[PDB]
Structure 1
Amino acid sequence: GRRILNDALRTIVNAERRGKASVELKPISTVMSSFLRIMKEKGYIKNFQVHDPHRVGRITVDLQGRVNDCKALTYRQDVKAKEIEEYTERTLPTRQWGYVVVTTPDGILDHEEAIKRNVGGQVLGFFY
């Protein structure tokens, strides 16, 4: 589901730079909504709603004008819990702001939370 995740994150970025209030995402997945929950918690989007997640899912996102770039990795990238911080140093362009989203056995988490819980996994992407 890497392609549709990158499609949705790019749709958000593109309508963000048009100054829009909301976007519609389709197709969606549970990975997409977990990425959006992490983005909403860090304040990059206002709110999001999931419609019909078990038949034909679409997501409405509420925008605020706060995200510069959201990217999904299109390749497999493993990271260990002791490896997360140096990866995030090399992956965020500012090396200060933004978050790397990791799929872990404890769930989909931002990179600081995954360091705190001492759990590694697969990098989904990042936003800043």
Structure 2
Amino acid sequence: TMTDPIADMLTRVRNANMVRHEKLELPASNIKKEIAEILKSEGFIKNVEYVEDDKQGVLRLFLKYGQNDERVITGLKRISKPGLRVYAKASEMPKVLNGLGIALVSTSEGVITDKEARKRNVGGEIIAYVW
């Protein structure tokens, strides 16, 4: 059965991006919503909507494409997994694409990006890479 909702969400985003879809609806959760908000703030997606219905709610992402129809999201990679969880220190925080990408992290100070983790000098569980 389902074992990694975050991986499912990332794969939904990847598949929609490949097929060049405009919107993407998935079941919601707080971690997923925070991930989507980070993506929007960083500019990888266009908009995020939350539908506060029954059954845990729905997230409705809107993907972003640049000029020439180029895809803003090149790739998403799950880093920490149920089968093996990954943590890093503040001084060991990895840079995605030499800084051109973001590493979504989960920290005592909320789920943030690797840039914010380095700035605040904190580590945590490296949820994902996005570039």
TM-score if structure 2 supplies the norm length? 0.83
How many residues get paired? 121
Instruction: Tell me what 1:29 maps to.
Output: 29
Q: Are 1:72 and 2:78 matched, yes or no?
A: yes
CA distance in 1, matches of 2:5, 2:74: 19
Cα RMSD, aligned residues only: 1.9
- Alpha carbons 2:29, 2:56 under 8 Å: kept: no
CA distance in 1, matches of 2:3, 2:114: 19
Instruction: Tell me what 1:122 maps to.
Output: 125
SS in 1 for 2:111: strand
Q: Are 1:46 and 2:55 matched, yes or no?
A: no
Structure 1 residue 54, shift from structure 2 partner = 7.7
SS in 2 for 1:116: helix
CA distance in 2, matches of 1:56, 1:29: 7
Q: Are 1:106 and 2:109 matched, yes or no?
A: yes
Over 3 Å counting, the alpha-carbon distance change for 1:6 and 1:37 in structure 2 is: same
Which structure carries more helix by proportion? 1
- Alpha carbons 1:2, 1:72 under 8 Å: kept: no
CA distance in 2, matches of 1:96, 1:121: 18
CA distance in 1, matches of 2:35, 2:53: 15
CA distance in 2, matches of 1:121, 1:3: 18
Structure 1 residue 96, shift from structure 2 partner = 4.0
Over 3 Å counting, the alpha-carbon distance change for 1:54 and 1:63 in structure 2 is: same
TM-score if structure 1 supplies the norm length? 0.85
Structure 1 residue 95, shift from structure 2 partner = 3.2
Over 3 Å counting, the alpha-carbon distance change for 1:54 and 1:83 in structure 2 is: farther
SS in 1 for 2:56: coil
Instruction: Tell me what 1:95 maps to.
Output: 98
Runs of at least 5 residues in structure 2 that lack an aligned partner in the other structure = 66-71
Structure 1 residue 71, shift from structure 2 partner = 2.1
CA distance in 2, matches of 1:95, 1:60: 30
- Alpha carbons 1:23, 1:61 under 8 Å: kept: yes
